[PDB]
Design a protein around this motif. Structure first.
Motif, mmCIF file in Angstrom:
data_model
loop_
_atom_site.group_PDB
_atom_site.id
_atom_site.type_symbol
_atom_site.label_atom_id
_atom_site.label_comp_id
_atom_site.label_asym_id
_atom_site.label_seq_id
_atom_site.Cartn_x
_atom_site.Cartn_y
_atom_site.Cartn_z
ATOM 1 N N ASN A 130 0.827 -1.201 0.000
ATOM 2 C CA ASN A 130 0.000 0.000 0.000
ATOM 3 C C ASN A 130 0.864 1.255 0.000
ATOM 4 O OD1 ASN A 130 -1.548 2.316 1.375
ATOM 5 N ND2 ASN A 130 -3.185 0.849 0.918
ATOM 6 N N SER A 131 2.063 1.148 0.576
ATOM 7 C CA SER A 131 2.972 2.288 0.592
ATOM 8 C C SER A 131 3.339 2.715 -0.822
ATOM 9 C CB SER A 131 4.229 1.947 1.391
ATOM 10 O OG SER A 131 5.236 2.924 1.197
ATOM 11 N N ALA A 132 3.590 1.750 -1.702
ATOM 12 C CA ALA A 132 3.942 2.025 -3.087
ATOM 13 C C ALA A 132 2.725 2.200 -3.985
ATOM 14 C CB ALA A 132 4.820 0.900 -3.636
ATOM 15 N N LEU A 133 1.520 1.980 -3.467
ATOM 16 C CA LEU A 133 0.293 2.129 -4.235
ATOM 17 C C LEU A 133 -0.222 3.553 -4.072
ATOM 18 C CD1 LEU A 133 -1.259 -1.311 -3.443
ATOM 19 C CD2 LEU A 133 -1.232 -0.343 -5.752
ATOM 20 N N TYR A 134 -0.248 4.301 -5.172
ATOM 21 C CA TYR A 134 -0.694 5.684 -5.164
ATOM 22 C C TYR A 134 -1.668 5.914 -6.309
ATOM 23 C CZ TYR A 134 1.900 7.184 -9.292
ATOM 24 O OH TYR A 134 2.355 7.347 -10.579
ATOM 25 N N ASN A 135 -2.554 6.887 -6.110
ATOM 26 C CA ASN A 135 -3.582 7.228 -7.081
ATOM 27 C C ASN A 135 -3.750 8.736 -7.112
ATOM 28 O OD1 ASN A 135 -5.776 7.540 -8.731
ATOM 29 N ND2 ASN A 135 -7.153 6.202 -7.571
ATOM 30 N N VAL A 136 -3.837 9.293 -8.316
ATOM 31 C CA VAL A 136 -4.027 10.725 -8.512
ATOM 32 C C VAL A 136 -5.459 10.961 -8.968
ATOM 33 C CG1 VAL A 136 -2.878 10.377 -10.729
ATOM 34 C CG2 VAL A 136 -3.423 12.696 -9.954
ATOM 35 N N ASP A 137 -6.160 11.845 -8.261
ATOM 36 C CA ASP A 137 -7.564 12.105 -8.535
ATOM 37 C C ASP A 137 -7.732 12.758 -9.905
ATOM 38 O OD1 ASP A 137 -10.350 12.469 -8.220
ATOM 39 O OD2 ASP A 137 -10.090 12.817 -6.068
ATOM 40 N N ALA A 138 -8.989 12.925 -10.301
ATOM 41 C CA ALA A 138 -9.296 13.498 -11.600
ATOM 42 C C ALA A 138 -8.859 14.959 -11.658
ATOM 43 C CB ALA A 138 -10.790 13.382 -11.899
ATOM 44 N N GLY A 139 -8.670 15.447 -12.882
ATOM 45 C CA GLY A 139 -8.223 16.814 -13.081
ATOM 46 C C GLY A 139 -6.912 17.135 -12.403
ATOM 47 N N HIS A 140 -6.051 16.138 -12.216
ATOM 48 C CA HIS A 140 -4.781 16.325 -11.533
ATOM 49 C C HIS A 140 -3.702 15.540 -12.263
ATOM 50 C CE1 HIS A 140 -6.684 18.558 -8.419
ATOM 51 N NE2 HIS A 140 -5.713 18.408 -7.536
ATOM 52 N N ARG A 141 -2.451 15.878 -11.961
ATOM 53 C CA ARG A 141 -1.295 15.203 -12.528
ATOM 54 C C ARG A 141 -0.358 14.806 -11.398
ATOM 55 N NH1 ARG A 141 -4.438 15.623 -15.482
ATOM 56 N NH2 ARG A 141 -4.588 16.265 -17.673
ATOM 57 N N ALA A 142 0.522 13.853 -11.690
ATOM 58 C CA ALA A 142 1.509 13.383 -10.731
ATOM 59 C C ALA A 142 2.902 13.475 -11.333
ATOM 60 C CB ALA A 142 1.220 11.943 -10.297
ATOM 61 N N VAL A 143 3.847 13.951 -10.527
ATOM 62 C CA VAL A 143 5.257 14.016 -10.894
ATOM 63 C C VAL A 143 6.011 13.105 -9.938
ATOM 64 C CG1 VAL A 143 5.525 16.096 -9.492
ATOM 65 C CG2 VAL A 143 7.295 15.461 -11.141
ATOM 66 N N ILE A 144 6.760 12.159 -10.494
ATOM 67 C CA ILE A 144 7.379 11.084 -9.730
ATOM 68 C C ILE A 144 8.871 11.363 -9.620
ATOM 69 C CG2 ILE A 144 7.815 9.646 -11.756
ATOM 70 C CD1 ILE A 144 6.991 8.614 -8.131
ATOM 71 N N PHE A 145 9.418 11.216 -8.414
ATOM 72 C CA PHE A 145 10.843 11.398 -8.175
ATOM 73 C C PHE A 145 11.452 10.061 -7.786
ATOM 74 C CE2 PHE A 145 14.760 13.228 -6.607
ATOM 75 C CZ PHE A 145 15.100 12.383 -5.571
ATOM 76 N N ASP A 146 12.458 9.631 -8.540
ATOM 77 C CA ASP A 146 13.189 8.402 -8.262
ATOM 78 C C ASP A 146 14.465 8.763 -7.511
ATOM 79 O OD1 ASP A 146 14.773 6.151 -8.202
ATOM 80 O OD2 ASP A 146 14.512 5.641 -10.316
ATOM 81 N N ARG A 147 14.652 8.162 -6.334
ATOM 82 C CA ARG A 147 15.856 8.439 -5.557
ATOM 83 C C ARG A 147 17.106 8.013 -6.313
ATOM 84 N NH1 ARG A 147 11.216 7.811 -1.926
ATOM 85 N NH2 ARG A 147 11.733 8.800 0.072
ATOM 86 N N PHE A 148 17.064 6.844 -6.953
ATOM 87 C CA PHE A 148 18.235 6.331 -7.651
ATOM 88 C C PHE A 148 18.442 6.985 -9.011
ATOM 89 C CE2 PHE A 148 18.584 1.920 -5.432
ATOM 90 C CZ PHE A 148 18.545 2.555 -4.208
ATOM 91 N N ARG A 149 17.428 7.669 -9.545
ATOM 92 C CA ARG A 149 17.541 8.336 -10.832
ATOM 93 C C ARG A 149 17.100 9.793 -10.796
ATOM 94 N NH1 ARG A 149 15.230 3.914 -15.277
ATOM 95 N NH2 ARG A 149 16.857 2.342 -14.923
ATOM 96 N N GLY A 150 16.711 10.315 -9.637
ATOM 97 C CA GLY A 150 16.303 11.700 -9.545
ATOM 98 C C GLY A 150 14.891 11.922 -10.060
#
Lengths: 193, 173, 118
Positions: free
Chosen positions: B1-21
């Motif tokens: 569940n920690s790695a399970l994420y959901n972005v609501d409607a009318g929204h965007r998500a920007v993902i940051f990778d620790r090993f790749r920035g």
């Protein structure tokens, strides 16, 4: 377990870690970007700098070409330069904003606003604003502080100068009302007749 | 569940990778999968966000206008990570104040209250175009830019009321 | 018993349910009318929009061609268009009235009344 915990660290949110090595102090030319990195438990103790540009409001009365005090308040947005993260620290410390911005900004204000009069300063506010922006950029360039945008957020004068301009508007309004008085006089003349 | 994420409607998500920035792409709406403890997401609003910017602005005729501008702005979807890295989620309060203030002051200094009210189209187009140009650098689209709250000083109100009272006095007299 | 309870839902009173799919978000072009429909227990979580036209009263001072402020309050009766239920939501959210009507109505009033005198 604590050996690994104190050995590798992650930098996030547009922050940069500069290692204060015990061999010779700040380890120059070892700046690193966002992500994950290895930090020596003892020799390297990183200092974290937030690269996100931090705006600041400066309220400093300054003299104009009319020799009148003008409490102009300026908002400045700036961020540290990535190239020179170590050296700036070496010559500025972890507290550089309050150590640099006040002097440069106030000196530039006093040396620039003094060259304009109130009417010209406000009517040509764009010219003086961009001139001070260029001056601030050049000045803070040596301090490794990249300037994002320089803008004037407020400008005020002594209550007497504002009273004078209000009286100017009063004079205009009175010279306008005079013709309405003339029309009223015409109607009163007809009534008298 | 920690790695399970959901972005609501009318929204965007920007993902940051620790090993790749930080990422170079932006994921869409709905639940998505990511590597636990390494890929941390940040949710930004793609829906048109309104904002009001009341301000006192000095016109060329030295008569300040208490003027409010309402702008419906949303961040550019493509450049969300860029703004996040540059300034972070506090991208409005760190940018919108300066750009709004400077744009409005520059627009107002061109003319005076009479010239302000006589030509609403001119000032509206000026503010719209200038704000769009300024936000182009910051990559935040302006869904709608509208100025709808005008107020002047008591002196210009006195002038206008004098004009109107004389005009009515014509008929009354 | 709860599997069926959460799986099929009825939409009534001129309301539209738009499914928020977990595959890619809002289920575009899957709009449905009044009646009964099958909603996926997890992937599809419907959002209900009331079609019934709602009124709103806007009070705001507006300038005129005479340079005088007039508080000409206006009432507007509006409903969402049935042919674009998803996209509007995607760009407006579940609160579009207070997010759209104020700006458009006030700008229109200022740009229309300002051209006329009392």
């Amino acid at each position: 377990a604590y050996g690994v915990r104190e050995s590798v660290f992650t930098v996030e949110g547009g922050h940069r870690a500069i290692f204060f090595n015990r061999i010779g102090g700040v380890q120059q030319d070892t700046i690193l970007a966002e992500g994950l990195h290895f930090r020596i438990p003892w020799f390297q103790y990183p200092i974290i700098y937030d690269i996100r540009a931090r705006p600041r409001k400066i309220s400093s009365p300054t003299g104009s070409k009319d020799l009148q005090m003008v409490n102009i308040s300026l908002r400045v947005l700036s961020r540290p330069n990535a190239q020179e993260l170590p050296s700036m620290y070496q010559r500025l410390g972890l507290d550089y904003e309050e150590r640099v911005l006040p002097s440069i900004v106030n000196e530039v204000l006093k040396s620039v606003v003094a060259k304009f009069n109130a009417s010209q300063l406000i009517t040509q506010r764009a010219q003086v604003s961009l001139l001070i922006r260029r001056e601030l950029t050049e000045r803070a360039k040596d301090f490794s502080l990249i300037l994002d945008d320089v803008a004037i957020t407020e400008l005020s004068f002594s209550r007497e100068y504002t009273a004078a301009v209000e009286a100017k508007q009063v004079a205009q309004q009175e010279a306008q009302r005079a013709q309405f008085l003339v029309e009223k006089a015409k109607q009163e003349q007809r009534q008298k007749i | 569940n920690s790695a399970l994420y959901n972005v609501d409607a009318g929204h965007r998500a920007v993902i940051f990778d620790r090993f790749r920035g930080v990422q170079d792409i932006v994921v869409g709406e709905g639940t998505h999968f990511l590597i636990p403890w390494v890929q941390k997401p940040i949710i930004f609003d793609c829906r048109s966000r309104p904002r009001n910017v009341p301000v006192i602005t000095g016109s060329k005729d030295l008569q300040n206008v208490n003027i409010t501008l309402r702008i419906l702005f949303r961040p550019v979807a493509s450049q969300l990570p860029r703004i996040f890295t540059s300034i972070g989620e506090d991208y409005d309060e760190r940018v919108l104040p300066s750009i709004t203030t400077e744009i409005l002051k520059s627009v107002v200094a061109r003319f005076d209250a009479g010239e302000l009210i006589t030509q609403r189209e001119l000032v509206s187009r000026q503010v719209s175009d200038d704000l769009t140009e300024r936000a182009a650098t910051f990559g935040l689209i302006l869904d709608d830019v509208s100025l709808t709250h005008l107020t002047f000083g008591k002196e210009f109100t006195e002038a206008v009321e004098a004009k109107q009272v004389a005009q009515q006095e014509a008929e009354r007299a």
